[PDB]
């Protein structure tokens, strides 16, 4: 009943050839909550958790591909940095979190996986707790089959983006978008605007009217061989990071920068990236084509290379011990 | 073990004189989740609920005092209005929600209770669902003992406030603060700034530098007998609404308006209000006293009247059927 492979129609993206074990009750998906490994149907958290009642929680998502977790080190580092930005003291060490998460994946038997690790301020206290020692933070994880924000044919042919105008990306003076978080009020409004206006993906602007990010993904713009991505109102993504390293390795200048609306529209190429789906082209904005409306050459070589980095031996990869 | 009453030291606030049934496992605390009435230790929601993973959820909190719910219809009306603002279609009617919530309180036996009702977009889908009919929203409730945002002595003596400078209330163009929500990034940052600077409660400003609201409460400013409260960056509180009704009853003009920092500091009186604690004075701001730094006559009149409205038979009350 669980779907854990596809035929992708892409040479450079291939799932692993294997069968889940029917006698394993965590096969195909599972969670780690409060010290126990559980099936998805049991993956529940206290309604009193502040991560629910005040979204007082940060998180990351890493993926596993062909049995190796991608940049797990970077992910857990960011997670802990983000927790610290919120004054949340993780109850586990980074190495303990890595060990538990890898074992969680191991128990699902999943070779291609989406793994969420969230850390909340816990359910033993309220925001009005004067005594910070009373807080009891929780780590909650789950691992499920790799999820694609964008379909395979759209990785190959491109997506039609829209610049949201009913909403702007929450400012850092209210909620820091460089700390990964569950407070998606603005991102969901943008998705809803996408539905209303008949487009496929929202790109948001910041309060200064400059390019920010999308709904769960960063945006990258290419112009005369120079590869740029918003530095400010944008999560420092690990896919983005990888994309800029790829660009540099291909001979292109690659930088975080402020990008105007005009520059977005005038781009030779535009692309999107996030852990849940990888990298894909954006071939139009607001119904206007980007160049000739087909995925650009530099975009295609970044995509192919990103998927090669998922499979080549390197320090980017941590193998799961099934 | 459960604390459900207090000696308050205030003549106008008195808890009911009763004992819980020790043989009733829901006594003193319970939740309603997915059709089941449960004790607090079994009150859990799916971690895949978009109300956690994307804070895609609105709520309200109503209280029960001496066995009567206070302004229950305004609350559920507001909750359904807020849900509509988010395009969440409640899976129950307003009347069904009232019936369940009152039954929940009955089973707890609490005569003085805090009751949360939240509605999420549910766990059967993600924000990347093209087909919006596949969303299955969830209503989650809990009822626990009445919760006081400020201690009794500070209702009497007044609270020392602080205008936050490290943070602004989230703009309406990102997350609408007139829709009650769990996305407290900014509110919590304002509270943390309160710890850092050594004050008791935060008041935020909006992006225009005008008075917004507090972390879980509305602010009201009184000057030459005129009672004003921020109209824009502030939740339309049912407590606020009651305060202005009371204010009109006493002969004062009472309005929603834009309030400056300078007006805040020059006020004759300032107070705070919310469901979880009632009404209370703010006797200083950033260390500067408001007037003579003791609670003012109008505020004291409001507070006393609010507590009479919690007790006198009127259309504002709905009895719990114990
Ligand atoms: C997950 C996410 C990204 C991408 O981060 P990766 O580390 O590449 O997964 C970008 N923006 C937002 C808002 C996100 O939630
Ligand atoms: C709950 C709340 C209030 C007060 O609303 P009531 O209807 O009086 O409870 C004010 N501001 C915020 C941000 C809130 O969450």
XYZ file of C-alpha atoms and ligand atoms in Angstrom:
674
model
C 0.000 0.000 0.000
C 2.938 2.418 0.713
C 4.565 3.780 -2.468
C 8.320 4.025 -2.071
C 9.733 3.899 -5.619
C 8.893 5.473 -8.945
C 10.211 5.263 -12.407
C 11.227 8.860 -12.799
C 11.740 9.084 -16.536
C 15.095 10.778 -15.779
C 18.422 9.105 -16.374
C 20.072 11.053 -13.532
C 17.447 10.194 -10.886
C 17.121 6.495 -10.050
C 15.524 4.920 -7.023
C 16.924 1.876 -5.370
C 15.787 -1.620 -6.409
C 14.538 -3.389 -3.283
C 11.539 -4.731 -1.393
C 10.257 -3.620 1.991
C 10.005 -6.410 4.588
C 6.324 -7.206 5.386
C 7.138 -8.512 8.904
C 8.734 -5.179 9.882
C 5.940 -2.923 11.290
C 7.990 0.259 10.732
C 8.777 -0.637 7.099
C 7.978 2.238 4.764
C 7.610 4.935 7.451
C 8.072 5.736 11.148
C 8.703 8.316 13.860
C 10.802 8.857 16.969
C 8.855 10.599 19.673
C 9.653 10.780 23.342
C 12.160 7.942 23.210
C 10.178 5.423 21.158
C 10.180 4.337 17.533
C 6.578 4.128 16.315
C 4.554 3.626 13.162
C 3.001 6.636 11.435
C -0.434 5.954 12.932
C 1.093 6.293 16.434
C 3.149 9.343 15.584
C 1.482 11.825 17.840
C 2.584 14.691 20.009
C 1.072 16.338 23.040
C -1.504 18.968 22.261
C 0.123 20.990 25.080
C 3.426 21.199 23.287
C 4.413 24.799 22.680
C 5.509 23.793 19.198
C 1.789 23.421 18.528
C 0.244 26.094 20.704
C 2.844 28.840 19.887
C 4.789 27.370 16.995
C 7.727 27.578 19.392
C 9.768 25.136 17.367
C 12.472 24.966 14.692
C 13.388 22.086 12.450
C 15.186 20.714 9.456
C 14.535 18.167 6.756
C 17.339 16.066 5.315
C 16.936 13.350 2.763
C 18.405 9.920 2.145
C 19.056 8.802 -1.398
C 20.325 5.341 -2.442
C 20.864 4.622 1.242
C 23.009 7.726 2.016
C 21.872 10.753 3.910
C 22.785 14.027 2.115
C 24.755 16.661 4.097
C 23.486 15.421 7.411
C 26.267 17.297 9.137
C 25.201 20.635 7.668
C 21.576 19.959 8.442
C 22.003 19.142 12.121
C 24.421 22.015 12.520
C 21.802 24.380 11.136
C 19.142 22.817 13.287
C 21.170 23.480 16.381
C 22.066 26.978 15.306
C 18.378 27.681 14.677
C 17.419 26.246 18.110
C 20.017 28.551 19.681
C 18.624 31.588 17.806
C 15.267 30.728 19.547
C 16.945 30.057 22.928
C 15.886 26.469 22.774
C 18.336 24.119 24.441
C 18.212 20.788 22.634
C 17.874 17.838 25.047
C 20.248 15.769 22.823
C 23.626 16.364 21.245
C 24.065 16.714 17.507
C 25.752 13.273 17.409
C 22.905 11.703 19.396
C 20.369 13.274 16.995
C 22.343 11.916 14.015
C 22.493 8.459 15.504
C 18.786 8.328 16.328
C 17.737 9.695 12.910
C 19.918 7.264 11.000
C 18.501 4.411 13.015
C 14.967 5.726 12.394
C 15.660 5.497 8.683
C 17.207 2.128 9.155
C 13.969 0.856 10.741
C 11.846 2.049 7.792
C 14.223 0.239 5.417
C 13.753 3.257 3.127
C 16.666 3.892 0.674
C 15.125 7.086 -0.586
C 13.643 9.096 2.279
C 12.399 12.445 3.687
C 13.396 12.855 7.322
C 12.009 15.662 9.507
C 13.672 16.513 12.796
C 11.934 19.174 14.850
C 12.861 20.604 18.215
C 10.150 22.339 20.260
C 10.258 24.133 23.591
C 8.151 21.305 24.968
C 4.863 20.723 26.773
C 5.874 21.151 30.385
C 5.759 24.970 30.370
C 4.201 28.096 28.782
C 5.797 31.220 27.162
C 4.926 33.051 30.415
C 7.245 30.776 32.421
C 9.626 33.134 34.246
C 11.949 30.207 35.242
C 13.692 29.008 32.081
C 14.906 25.805 33.800
C 11.289 24.564 33.838
C 11.212 24.324 30.029
C 11.554 20.714 28.797
C 12.319 20.757 25.025
C 11.400 17.799 22.855
C 12.855 16.323 19.707
C 10.463 14.648 17.322
C 11.487 12.914 14.122
C 9.847 11.094 11.279
C 11.011 9.375 8.185
C 8.792 8.778 5.230
C 9.280 8.136 1.497
C 11.101 10.883 -0.383
C 8.629 13.681 -1.254
C 8.754 15.716 -4.476
C 7.632 19.336 -4.270
C 7.737 19.290 -8.108
C 6.813 16.401 -10.480
C 9.469 14.616 -12.591
C 8.238 15.993 -15.914
C 8.413 19.502 -14.420
C 12.061 19.018 -13.333
C 12.690 18.369 -17.015
C 10.404 20.958 -18.596
C 10.143 23.730 -15.968
C 7.562 25.336 -13.678
C 5.435 28.447 -14.128
C 6.091 30.817 -11.200
C 4.111 33.809 -9.923
C 5.246 36.808 -7.909
C 2.868 37.127 -4.953
C 1.355 40.556 -4.516
C -1.241 39.955 -1.752
C 1.461 39.017 0.731
C 5.136 39.748 1.602
C 7.621 37.443 3.360
C 7.461 37.953 7.086
C 10.187 40.445 8.105
C 13.069 39.489 10.211
C 11.906 42.053 12.752
C 8.950 39.825 13.466
C 9.966 36.312 12.465
C 13.404 35.461 11.266
C 13.181 33.699 7.968
C 16.788 32.490 8.350
C 15.622 30.201 11.113
C 13.636 27.373 9.645
C 10.156 27.381 11.181
C 6.628 26.205 10.947
C 4.994 29.673 10.812
C 3.828 29.518 7.233
C 0.922 32.009 7.362
C 2.552 34.148 4.686
C 3.766 31.191 2.548
C 0.286 29.626 2.564
C -1.345 32.902 1.638
C 1.091 32.932 -1.324
C 0.115 29.393 -2.347
C -3.519 30.394 -2.106
C -2.794 33.408 -4.316
C -1.186 30.957 -6.778
C -4.394 28.963 -6.899
C -6.481 32.087 -7.382
C -4.338 33.437 -10.214
C -3.810 30.103 -11.895
C -0.032 29.603 -11.575
C 2.096 26.741 -10.179
C 4.506 28.157 -7.603
C 4.714 31.366 -5.556
C 7.766 33.583 -5.228
C 7.585 36.132 -2.448
C 9.135 39.587 -2.077
C 10.428 41.174 1.106
C 9.380 44.426 2.731
C 11.853 46.379 0.611
C 10.253 44.863 -2.506
C 13.246 42.598 -3.323
C 13.144 38.903 -4.162
C 12.878 36.675 -1.076
C 11.991 33.000 -1.446
C 9.204 30.563 -2.250
C 6.885 28.353 -0.268
C 9.355 25.853 1.141
C 12.140 26.468 -1.427
C 14.818 29.053 -2.401
C 15.022 30.769 -5.767
C 18.140 31.279 -7.904
C 18.610 33.685 -10.794
C 21.135 33.495 -13.611
C 22.164 36.379 -15.809
C 25.194 36.504 -18.148
C 26.672 33.455 -16.483
C 26.452 34.983 -12.960
C 24.424 32.894 -10.544
C 22.665 34.770 -7.758
C 20.235 34.028 -4.934
C 18.546 36.189 -2.311
C 20.749 36.622 0.728
C 18.254 38.229 3.134
C 14.601 37.130 3.231
C 15.455 33.511 2.529
C 16.348 30.457 4.518
C 19.982 29.573 4.124
C 19.138 26.337 2.379
C 21.450 23.375 2.087
C 20.264 22.698 -1.476
C 20.959 26.354 -2.300
C 24.372 26.012 -0.750
C 25.056 22.990 -2.873
C 23.792 24.768 -5.947
C 26.171 27.680 -5.516
C 29.098 25.228 -4.983
C 28.089 23.483 -8.224
C 27.934 26.770 -10.082
C 31.402 27.722 -8.843
C 32.774 24.290 -9.819
C 31.373 24.910 -13.319
C 33.245 28.234 -13.696
C 30.449 30.666 -12.704
C 30.491 33.399 -10.183
C 27.910 32.419 -7.547
C 26.740 34.785 -4.849
C 24.099 35.678 -2.362
C 22.699 39.099 -3.400
C 19.713 41.436 -3.526
C 17.688 40.718 -6.649
C 15.099 43.103 -8.001
C 11.850 42.258 -9.641
C 13.104 43.645 -12.900
C 16.178 41.389 -12.709
C 14.033 38.338 -12.038
C 11.989 39.021 -15.126
C 15.008 39.804 -17.309
C 16.924 36.645 -16.240
C 18.506 34.209 -18.708
C 17.482 31.439 -16.302
C 15.597 31.002 -13.089
C 15.468 27.914 -10.883
C 14.135 26.632 -7.580
C 15.659 24.372 -4.989
C 14.784 22.642 -1.730
C 15.602 19.342 0.029
C 12.159 17.824 -0.848
C 12.512 17.683 -4.615
C 16.027 18.937 -5.317
C 16.455 21.487 -8.092
C 14.097 22.417 -10.965
C 13.714 25.178 -13.606
C 11.294 28.121 -13.489
C 10.505 28.842 -17.172
C 8.029 31.707 -16.663
C 7.066 34.438 -14.168
C 3.483 35.910 -14.138
C 2.935 34.311 -17.561
C 6.018 36.030 -19.013
C 8.610 33.532 -20.296
C 12.145 33.507 -18.851
C 14.199 33.973 -22.055
C 12.766 31.458 -24.502
C 10.657 29.655 -21.859
C 12.660 26.446 -21.896
C 15.047 25.283 -19.163
C 18.439 26.987 -19.652
C 21.725 25.162 -20.131
C 23.312 26.220 -16.895
C 20.161 25.125 -14.958
C 20.234 21.662 -16.607
C 23.841 21.074 -15.786
C 23.274 22.167 -12.152
C 20.342 19.726 -11.863
C 22.281 16.813 -13.345
C 25.273 17.577 -11.183
C 23.181 17.875 -7.990
C 21.886 14.374 -8.599
C 25.437 13.118 -9.262
C 26.455 14.507 -5.874
C 23.769 12.393 -4.295
C 25.482 9.210 -5.537
C 29.290 9.912 -5.747
C 31.532 9.050 -2.757
C 32.331 12.142 -0.728
C 32.022 13.807 2.632
C 28.534 14.947 1.637
C 27.261 11.389 2.174
C 26.645 9.450 5.375
C 25.588 5.823 4.779
C 22.613 4.386 6.681
C 23.379 0.957 8.207
C 20.338 -1.007 7.274
C -2.560 17.026 42.661
C -4.494 19.340 40.271
C -4.885 22.934 41.422
C -8.366 24.140 40.503
C -9.101 26.931 43.007
C -7.345 29.764 44.806
C -7.838 32.297 47.501
C -7.492 35.364 45.348
C -7.305 38.138 47.926
C -9.780 40.122 45.765
C -13.405 40.484 46.833
C -14.715 40.579 43.266
C -13.091 37.348 42.073
C -14.219 34.180 43.834
C -13.787 30.536 42.813
C -16.534 27.968 43.286
C -16.701 25.884 46.452
C -16.667 22.270 45.336
C -14.424 19.204 45.041
C -13.595 17.086 41.984
C -14.848 13.484 41.828
C -11.730 11.364 42.486
C -13.370 8.473 40.576
C -13.708 10.490 37.388
C -10.525 10.108 35.289
C -11.324 13.322 33.269
C -11.822 15.366 36.408
C -9.844 18.593 36.427
C -8.538 18.329 32.831
C -9.448 16.862 29.455
C -9.357 17.089 25.684
C -11.522 16.230 22.736
C -9.538 14.919 19.829
C -10.837 13.137 16.752
C -14.108 12.280 18.389
C -12.725 11.042 21.704
C -12.818 12.641 25.155
C -9.413 11.894 26.730
C -7.331 12.760 29.848
C -4.418 15.206 29.437
C -1.779 12.485 29.317
C -3.550 10.928 26.294
C -4.232 14.246 24.582
C -2.097 14.008 21.411
C -2.431 15.070 17.774
C -0.830 13.620 14.678
C 2.576 15.077 14.015
C 1.552 15.244 10.301
C -1.175 17.723 11.173
C -0.550 20.872 9.152
C -1.457 22.767 12.334
C 1.950 21.648 13.598
C 4.038 21.414 10.429
C 2.862 24.767 8.986
C 0.937 26.340 11.859
C -2.045 26.101 9.515
C -4.591 26.603 12.249
C -6.699 29.184 14.026
C -8.260 29.041 17.444
C -10.043 30.739 20.255
C -10.004 30.466 23.989
C -13.123 30.977 26.066
C -13.402 30.638 29.796
C -15.996 29.279 32.183
C -16.545 30.995 35.517
C -18.771 29.807 38.372
C -20.234 27.182 36.007
C -21.056 29.497 33.071
C -19.298 29.930 29.794
C -18.612 33.640 29.042
C -19.562 34.952 25.621
C -19.453 31.544 24.016
C -21.341 32.583 20.873
C -19.044 35.533 20.189
C -16.123 33.162 20.576
C -17.310 30.480 18.228
C -18.430 33.145 15.811
C -14.993 34.641 15.885
C -13.416 31.233 15.501
C -15.457 30.412 12.413
C -14.871 33.807 10.940
C -11.078 33.320 11.427
C -11.239 29.880 9.925
C -12.989 31.356 6.900
C -10.261 34.010 6.591
C -7.784 31.075 6.236
C -10.059 29.077 3.880
C -10.374 26.330 6.371
C -13.801 24.756 6.274
C -14.743 23.548 9.751
C -15.838 19.881 9.727
C -18.529 20.704 12.355
C -21.103 23.467 12.705
C -20.900 26.192 15.294
C -23.697 24.637 17.275
C -21.952 21.206 17.184
C -18.743 22.839 18.431
C -20.549 24.531 21.315
C -22.259 21.288 22.351
C -18.959 19.398 22.361
C -17.017 22.084 24.180
C -19.672 22.377 26.906
C -19.774 18.604 27.322
C -15.961 18.595 27.576
C -16.124 21.068 30.433
C -18.878 19.043 32.149
C -16.678 15.949 32.163
C -13.788 17.894 33.691
C -16.194 19.234 36.345
C -14.311 22.496 36.258
C -16.474 25.460 37.363
C -13.567 27.787 36.530
C -11.931 26.720 33.296
C -9.809 27.782 30.310
C -11.058 26.150 27.125
C -9.078 26.055 23.888
C -10.735 25.208 20.596
C -8.479 24.958 17.573
C -9.234 24.142 14.000
C -6.451 22.967 11.735
C -6.289 22.129 8.038
C -5.638 18.592 9.220
C -3.225 15.758 8.569
C -4.572 14.242 5.341
C -2.761 16.640 3.002
C 0.052 19.252 2.580
C 0.160 22.855 1.353
C 1.216 21.515 -2.097
C -2.165 19.819 -2.672
C -3.540 20.981 -6.008
C -6.836 19.295 -5.128
C -8.096 21.331 -2.170
C -10.966 18.927 -1.577
C -8.450 16.470 -0.157
C -7.939 18.629 2.944
C -9.671 17.191 6.027
C -9.668 19.844 8.745
C -9.618 18.851 12.441
C -11.087 20.381 15.546
C -9.112 19.872 18.743
C -10.262 21.055 22.173
C -8.958 21.065 25.672
C -10.282 22.260 28.958
C -8.046 22.846 31.928
C -8.213 25.033 35.037
C -8.579 28.741 34.524
C -5.212 30.317 33.686
C -4.085 33.741 34.898
C -1.657 35.660 32.746
C -0.928 37.961 35.702
C -1.023 37.095 39.397
C -3.824 38.373 41.624
C -1.624 40.865 43.452
C -0.713 42.493 40.140
C -4.349 42.754 39.066
C -4.583 44.759 42.293
C -1.259 46.634 42.242
C -0.592 46.839 38.525
C 1.982 45.440 36.128
C 5.246 46.996 34.977
C 5.246 47.062 31.177
C 7.903 47.505 28.512
C 7.639 48.582 24.880
C 9.588 46.049 22.874
C 12.280 47.427 20.595
C 13.815 44.143 19.281
C 10.761 43.132 17.457
C 7.576 44.470 15.807
C 4.116 42.896 15.552
C 3.888 40.829 12.434
C 2.436 42.881 9.636
C -0.992 42.171 8.241
C 0.579 41.744 4.811
C 2.354 38.633 6.116
C 0.236 37.133 8.914
C -2.971 38.847 9.854
C -2.996 39.633 13.556
C -6.790 40.041 13.437
C -6.993 36.271 12.890
C -6.138 34.442 16.109
C -3.187 32.168 15.477
C -0.362 30.143 17.024
C 2.466 31.808 15.113
C 4.036 33.568 18.072
C 7.631 34.084 16.777
C 7.400 37.825 17.394
C 5.369 37.579 20.623
C 7.864 35.190 22.143
C 10.786 37.369 21.100
C 9.048 40.253 22.870
C 8.724 38.138 26.016
C 12.375 37.135 25.868
C 13.235 40.814 25.571
C 11.160 41.344 28.721
C 13.393 38.850 30.611
C 16.585 40.478 29.254
C 15.569 43.999 30.290
C 13.916 43.033 33.605
C 10.254 43.936 33.148
C 7.057 41.998 33.582
C 5.169 42.306 30.258
C 5.774 43.343 26.640
C 3.854 45.736 24.463
C 4.719 45.596 20.790
C 4.552 48.346 18.145
C 3.517 47.809 14.547
C 5.733 48.572 11.546
C 4.435 52.154 11.566
C 5.694 52.526 15.109
C 2.173 52.685 16.537
C 0.865 50.608 19.464
C -0.175 47.140 18.553
C -0.762 44.550 21.303
C 0.909 42.370 23.920
C 1.945 38.764 23.914
C -1.523 37.201 24.347
C -3.449 40.336 25.353
C -4.838 43.635 24.125
C -3.812 47.054 25.429
C -6.173 49.957 26.243
C -5.126 53.541 26.969
C -7.209 56.110 28.837
C -6.732 59.877 28.536
C -9.051 62.651 29.850
C -11.840 60.080 30.339
C -11.548 58.727 26.760
C -10.840 55.039 26.406
C -8.862 53.940 23.355
C -7.443 50.684 22.072
C -5.410 49.899 18.931
C -7.619 49.128 16.025
C -5.098 47.676 13.572
C -2.228 45.411 14.701
C -4.298 43.740 17.330
C -6.623 40.832 17.676
C -10.317 41.895 18.063
C -10.456 40.585 21.650
C -13.739 39.570 23.223
C -12.250 40.872 26.456
C -11.382 44.143 24.687
C -14.909 44.254 23.346
C -16.270 43.799 26.810
C -14.002 46.471 28.214
C -15.246 49.031 25.700
C -18.867 48.039 26.337
C -18.235 48.532 30.074
C -16.488 51.812 29.339
C -19.450 53.145 27.364
C -21.816 52.037 30.189
C -19.864 54.193 32.574
C -20.274 57.332 30.441
C -16.916 57.286 28.612
C -16.344 57.518 24.910
C -14.653 54.240 23.898
C -13.083 53.662 20.541
C -10.621 51.804 18.421
C -7.833 54.107 17.173
C -4.155 54.617 16.404
C -2.176 55.214 19.517
C 1.316 56.723 19.580
C 4.172 55.891 21.855
C 3.988 59.404 23.243
C 0.259 58.949 23.917
C 0.967 55.652 25.639
C 3.474 57.286 27.986
C 1.265 60.363 28.618
C -1.889 58.371 29.354
C -3.825 58.911 32.551
C -4.310 55.113 32.682
C -3.291 51.991 30.816
C -4.629 48.450 31.168
C -4.296 45.040 29.612
C -6.946 42.458 28.839
C -7.388 38.900 27.628
C -9.537 35.791 28.219
C -6.797 34.163 30.280
C -6.697 36.513 33.231
C -9.340 39.178 32.696
C -8.362 42.835 32.995
C -5.363 44.370 34.800
C -3.545 47.697 35.207
C -0.257 48.671 33.660
C 1.220 51.169 36.097
C 4.503 51.882 34.364
C 6.043 51.636 30.920
C 9.826 51.218 30.507
C 10.268 52.311 34.114
C 8.245 55.508 33.732
C 5.096 55.549 35.803
C 1.754 56.119 34.149
C 0.427 59.095 36.185
C 1.191 58.471 39.845
C 2.027 54.800 39.137
C -0.964 53.265 40.922
C -4.077 51.775 39.258
C -6.521 54.508 38.060
C -10.242 54.877 38.935
C -11.623 54.038 35.542
C -9.490 50.883 35.266
C -10.496 49.738 38.714
C -14.162 50.316 37.754
C -13.692 48.356 34.561
C -12.028 45.484 36.332
C -14.692 45.202 39.029
C -17.467 45.469 36.466
C -15.944 42.773 34.225
C -15.985 40.385 37.191
C -19.628 41.247 37.981
C -20.536 40.454 34.358
C -18.955 37.007 34.926
C -21.419 36.367 37.772
C -24.705 38.285 37.137
C -27.266 36.474 34.924
C -27.197 37.934 31.477
C -27.283 36.755 27.864
C -23.483 36.652 27.926
C -23.525 33.471 30.009
C -24.196 29.843 28.999
C -24.471 27.262 31.758
C -22.384 24.189 31.747
C -24.523 21.069 32.441
C -22.563 19.252 35.092
C 13.068 23.978 3.547
C 13.031 25.403 3.124
C 13.988 25.923 2.134
C 15.058 25.018 1.536
O 16.043 24.541 2.471
P 16.930 23.233 2.158
O 17.908 23.306 3.304
O 17.427 23.397 0.721
O 15.926 22.149 2.302
C 13.872 27.240 1.718
N 12.938 28.073 2.183
C 12.032 27.698 3.110
C 11.049 28.686 3.590
C 11.995 26.333 3.637
O 11.079 25.950 4.574
C -6.057 35.860 22.867
C -5.413 37.075 22.347
C -5.894 38.406 22.722
C -7.138 38.562 23.585
O -8.341 38.072 22.954
P -9.601 37.646 23.917
O -10.668 37.447 22.850
O -9.891 38.816 24.845
O -9.090 36.435 24.593
C -5.216 39.511 22.217
N -4.138 39.404 21.446
C -3.610 38.232 21.067
C -2.377 38.143 20.222
C -4.219 36.989 21.496
O -3.680 35.811 21.135
